Amino acid sequence: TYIVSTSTAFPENYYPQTVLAAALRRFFTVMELDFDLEQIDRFFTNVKIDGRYFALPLLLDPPTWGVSISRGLENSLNLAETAITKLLEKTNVQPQDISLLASVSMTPAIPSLDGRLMNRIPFSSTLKRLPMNGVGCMGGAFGISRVADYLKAHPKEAAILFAVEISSALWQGSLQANLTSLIRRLPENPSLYSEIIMDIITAALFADGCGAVLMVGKEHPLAKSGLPQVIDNRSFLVPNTVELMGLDVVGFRNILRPEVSDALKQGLRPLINGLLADNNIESENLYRWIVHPGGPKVIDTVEAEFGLDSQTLQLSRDTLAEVGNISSATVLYMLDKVLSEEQSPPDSYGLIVAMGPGLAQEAILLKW
């Protein structure tokens, strides 16, 4: 399977990280929440993000959850349509010649976003769809793997994957309600301190955006040398870590416990060592890593586990700095950057790695 091209789409409002930190501090202050405001600055600074796109409005006067979901759906569709149209235009592919449209998003959508897009883009009415959910930050890498598996059996076909997330939905009421309750119960329940920090970290980290990728089977006319080929992929799920990472219905609450970066270690090396060995490759001979930046702590952990030079994962840090954590879309944005870089040397190997709720990890071996 060949990765042919990529595109991204972002909403119109880009906020400096310092403005978002200030917006949350003002919420704490207007609400008279008894909490150290310097903790907001600390985590908004320590995530190493310069600014974020928010599709939904920037705390004090929240709409109904129904209205926020309606806006989230609309914005998800708008971003996905933009990305897919840019993708089709840049490759000169007609929508009717796409066989499969795969999607990942935690935006609630029944019918799925990919079905609603059939009314915006003239796909054939018999388009095959692959709407995935329950994978969180991992979804971009996960979707690449599932589409590659599909194209194994359909070598003449073309498929599009998109990932789109609206993290700003959490700023429409969920973060406000939860931080208020937690901080006000904190004097009688000091165990809640870590819960407040988790919500502040969520507010510091997650952003909005969309990425899309065109992939084709080996017999497709766009399967040309010089493109990255997906040569293998593998999944891993670490036992008994469901509670470390997820998205719970309450609005929503993001779950991201500090123990993630250590539980990551239990899955990363068996997953990647096994994938590489089964393909007769040594990690030291990888030309490129494309690692989803769950956080700076996650990047540091991957770097330490595989003894990497600190420049090897620079793309993860630059991406975090530019757009924040855009969840499943992040590795597609990252792949897009790489496809804009200098033509990778022939026969160079690359690894895409992402981690998400599960705790689950996905690894994809690429060859140029």
Ligand X SMILES: CCCC[C@H](Cl)CCCCC(=O)SCCNC(C)=O
Catalytic residue among 137, 245, 302, 359: 137
Nearer to its own copies by Cβ, of 58 and 130: the residue is 130
Rule CB under 6 A: choose which of 82, 103, 241, 254 binds ligand X: 254
Task: Using alpha carbons only, give the angle 144, 87, 142 rounded to the nearest 5 degrees.
Answer: 10
The option from its own copies, ligand X, none interacting with 119 (CB < 5 to 8 A, set by class) reads its own copies
d(CA 245, CA 241): 8
Cβ proximity of 235 and 94 under 8 Å: no
- Residue 29 Cβ, how far from its own copies at the closest point, in Å? 28
Is 137 one of the binding residues for ligand X (CB under 6 A)? yes
The answer to the question of residue 327 lying near ligand X (CB under 6 A) is yes
Can residue 350 be called a binding residue for its own copies (CB under 8 A)? Answer: no
**Site membership for ligand X, residue 178 (CB under 6 A):** no
Closer to its own copies by Cβ: residue 232 or 322: 232
294 binds its own copies (CB under 8 A): no
43's CB contacts (< 8 A; 6+ apart) are 197, 200, 201, 204
Beta bridge partners of 129: 101
Query: Of ligand X, its own copies, none, which one sits near residue 13, judging by CB under 5 to 8 A according to partner kind?
Result: none
DSSP states of 15-37: EEHHHHHHHHHHHHHHTT--S-T
Residues 134, 139, 142, 144: what is their CA dihedral angle, to the nearest 10 degrees?
140
Please select the residue that binds ligand X; options are 81, 114, 157, 165, rule is CB under 6 A: 165
210 catalytic? Reply is no
Binding residue (CB under 6 A) for ligand X from 15, 236, 252, 349: 252
Q: Could you give the string, one character per residue 281-320, with x where binding to ligand X holds by CB under 6 A and - elsewhere?
A: ----------------------------------------
Q: Which residue has the tokens 């239990």?
A: 266
- Polymer length in residues for the chain: 368
Among 206, 236, 289, 349, binds ligand X (CB under 6 A): 206
End-to-end CA distance of the chain, in Å?
12
| 169 makes contact with ligand X (CB under 6 A) | yes
> Which C-beta is closer to its own copies: that of 113 or that of 331?
113
Q: What is the DSSP string of 182-226?
A: HHHHGGG-GGGHHHHHHHHHHHHHB-EEEEEEEEE-TTSTT--TT
Q: For the residues of 281-328, what is the DSSP string, one character each?
A: --GGG-SEEEE--S-HHHHHHHHHHTT--TTTTHHHHHHHHHH-B-GG
Q: Which residues lie near its own copies (CB under 8 A)?
A: 65-66, 69, 103, 106, 108-116, 118-119, 125-136, 146, 149-150, 152-154, 234-240, 242, 245-250, 267, 270-271, 274, 356-360
- Catalytic site residues? 137
Q: Which residues lie near ligand X (CB under 6 A)?
A: 69, 72, 106-107, 110, 136-137, 165-167, 169-170, 206, 245-247, 252, 254, 327, 356-357
